[PDB]
Amino acid sequence: GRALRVLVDMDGVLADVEGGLLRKFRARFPDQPFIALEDRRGYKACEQYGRLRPGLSEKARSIAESKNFFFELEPLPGAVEAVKEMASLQNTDVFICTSPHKMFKYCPYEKYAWVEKYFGPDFLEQIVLTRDKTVVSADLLIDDRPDITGAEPTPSWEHVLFTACHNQHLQLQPPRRRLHSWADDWKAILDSKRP
Template identity: 25%
Template sequence: MKQRLLVDMDGVLADIYAQLIEFEYQELGIRQSYEKMNGTSEVDTFKNALEYIFSDGFFRNLPVMEGSIEVMRQLNEKYELFIVSAAMEFPKSLTDKFYWLEEHFPFLHWKQIVMCGSKTVIKGDIMIDDHFKNLDYFDGKTLLFSQPHNSSGNTKNHTRVDSWSDVAKILL
């Protein structure tokens, strides 16, 4: 029986920081640097982050994380793979996220997509996420995908990965 692998979307498959940087630059002419973001949340870093995140189409047009498509294709063959997103926090994102996955990860079946409110109800063997709040309760193996908001602090029992190449080295 294959192990169940759960993969987050925002900050893991989709580059939400790149999108926020671009939105803020287009609107305010401010170009944030990743170095200045370390240790701060998206809301603390970007003046209008919530406005951007709640806008129509924000999640539909997120850039894809480098290397994620090919590694996910391989992981899909080896694991019982599910995309798990706490999308209910941003209701406008539901359709956007579905069509984004369909466009960039067409090898995934719609039955492999879980949109939820809290990830505490999700069970599996391995979880890849960029938020401690989703990994800390998880009973299985956890991979913390590096993002500016999780750069400081103790990773606890989580294995930090900085790229999809790191994920491949561990899981393939």
């Protein structure tokens, strides 16, 4: 029978982008103010730094653009184990669908290397790098961005919001769904999309 196809974005779902940004920002710019994760709002971290102090958007971006930023990101709790299990379920195909952002020098490569490091070489085959997720056909999309963007107005996938510091204050209106973490019942969400 037809496999359930699930898209999972790495950023803020598998790899701890927010923790990495904060940790490296503080170490490189110890005499500047920063944004504690609890105070993060909106997926655009650099823009919020810019509102904190003129010039900090540029510094935050320079952190994310630096070599090894993506590669040294820590996996989120229970992320690697859940996705490995997910991919092992019958009638389930998992693709990692994630953005190069506008940082083409190191980001694409390190994302591949990160996935290989935690998931193995085999899994590299399932990666789709795109700014626009709406052109990718699937049953479910799990990512940390509350807003959908891209060329297809109504994507084929249901969008499920993975909780992150910057989105946790949003109270989603049904039938919009939230996955609180990888300890949460993700199997139930998948099962709901099966025949």
